[PDB]
Amino acid sequence: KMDTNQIRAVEPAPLTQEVSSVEFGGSSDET
Amino acid sequence: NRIAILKYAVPFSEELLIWSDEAQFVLTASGTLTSKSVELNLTTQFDVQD
């Protein structure tokens, strides 16, 4: 059971995705 | 270490006997067969023929 034991010790990480978003400021109008 | 062709196999239940001219083998898994736990052991050395 050497193969089964070692593969159980592999444990890769899932690493789900993560995303952010843009921002716009805008302007104030004079005259 | 000796390229032995496999001629006869007899399944019982939990072990599979592999017989090749000068070397005999047992294929036992424990639990499910499942490739990772498939295993093989060189049990006997007696002579079988074609």
Phi (first) and psi of residue A4, to 5 degrees: -70, -40
CA–CA separation, B18 vs B38, rounded Å? Answer: 13
Contact B25, B34 (CB under 8 A): no
Query: Residue B33 and residue A3: Cα distance in Å, rounded?
Result: 12
Asked if the Cβ–Cβ distance from B37 to A7 is below 8 Å, we say no
Q: What is the resolution of this structure in A?
A: 3.5
Chain A residues close to B32, C-beta within 8 Å: none
Give strand pairing partners of B18: B9, B25
The answer to whether B30 faces chain A, any CB pair under 8 Å, is: yes
